[PDB]
């Protein structure tokens, strides 16, 4: 049936780490850069720390603990795992630092150094991330370039679980949503696939905004006439096709993340055959204190 989720949730002392600089405020809370010393181990760990709005109403603490629950429950080279939490007064989520920031921001800002190799690779890595989540019977409900972060240029991870679900239970980025989603609040993994397609489109179009201008209450309408996003100017038919396959109405006609890994993977073997980028093959894509004992979190594991 369903297995016992034996994830260990780590409680971190507020003494165990320094904050170091803001990364993102406004929205629904701060996120800081920071260092972490898992006391009694003598190792520094660059981290990020999502702290909830200082206005620590009970209506919110629920939502951030939900994240924590999920983030604590995953483990994949392409899925941001929770390092631990911290109980001050507002709950602090402590995850591994994704220094290069979110993928959207990245491709927008490096438009000119992004080769097919990179684009095609992130496609693989996200399909990988997402496939895992499928295995762990999870629905994300917010796959989006803004929600994929960057460890290195050749390492992206899926993040932001503020919206996740086990598939079939009960508990708005409209322009990223499957149809059954907008008209019926239905959410399969195959709806996540649609956002995948959209996320690919974001990347292939160097961070363009899907359905730009076009007001949202109208998306249900357009989509229902059978209209989708345009081939990005760099996309061979083969890439563009695979995007369009995620946008089929009948959702089992969408492809599965597992096949998505395979095709893209195939393609990332001969990248210039599949994306046509100007001067492609000529492209190629942070401290203080000690740093002697600095280790990245992916190399920090307790049983
Ligand atoms: C250095 O860049 C980041 C690394 C990150 N590393 C790990 N996690 C991040 N966010 C995050 C996401 C979910 C979580 F539960 C937690 Cl604890 C943290 C990170 C967010 C980061 O920045 C997010 C991008 C902020 N932009 C900056 C410009 O204004 C709009 C939003």
Curated annotation (Swiss-Prot):
Q: What does this protein do?
A: Receptor tyrosine kinase binding ligands of the EGF family and activating several signaling cascades to convert extracellular cues into appropriate cellular responses. Known ligands include EGF, TGFA/TGF-alpha, AREG, epigen/EPGN, BTC/betacellulin, epiregulin/EREG and HBEGF/heparin-binding EGF. Ligand binding triggers receptor homo- and/or heterodimerization and autophosphorylation on key cytoplasmic residues. The phosphorylated receptor recruits adapter proteins like GRB2 which in turn activates complex downstream signaling cascades. Isoform 2 may act as an antagonist of EGF action.
Quick one: effect of changing residue 14 to K?
Answer: Found in a lung cancer sample
Protein known as: Epidermal growth factor receptor
The effect annotated for residue 50 to A/M is: Abolishes kinase activity
Cite the effect that the entry attributes to residue 74 to M.
Found in a lung cancer sample
Where is ATP annotated to bind?
A: 23-31, 50, 95-96, 160
Subunit and partners = Binding of the ligand triggers homo- and/or heterodimerization of the receptor triggering its autophosphorylation. Heterodimer with ERBB2. Forms a complex with CCDC88A/GIV (via SH2-like regions) and GNAI3 which leads to enhanced EGFR signaling and triggering of cell migration; binding to CCDC88A requires autophosphorylation of the EGFR C-terminal region, and ligand stimulation is required for recruitment of GNAI3 to the complex. Interacts with ERRFI1; inhibits dimerization of the kinase domain and autophosphorylation. Part of a complex with ERBB2 and either PIK3C2A or PIK3C2B.
Hey, where's the site called Important for interaction with PIK3C2B on this chain? 300
Per the record, the gene is EGFR
**PTM-bearing positions, type Phosphotyrosine:** 300
**Mutating residue 138 to V: effect?**
Found in a lung cancer sample; more sensitive to gefitinib than wild-type
Q: Which organism is it from?
A: Homo sapiens
What disease does the Swiss-Prot or TrEMBL record associate with this chain? Lung cancer: A common malignancy affecting tissues of the lung. The most common form of lung cancer is non-small cell lung cancer (NSCLC) that can be divided into 3 major histologic subtypes: squamous cell carcinoma, adenocarcinoma, and large cell lung cancer. NSCLC is often diagnosed at an advanced stage and has a poor prognosis.
Q: Localized where?
A: Cell membrane; Endoplasmic reticulum membrane; Golgi apparatus membrane; Nucleus membrane
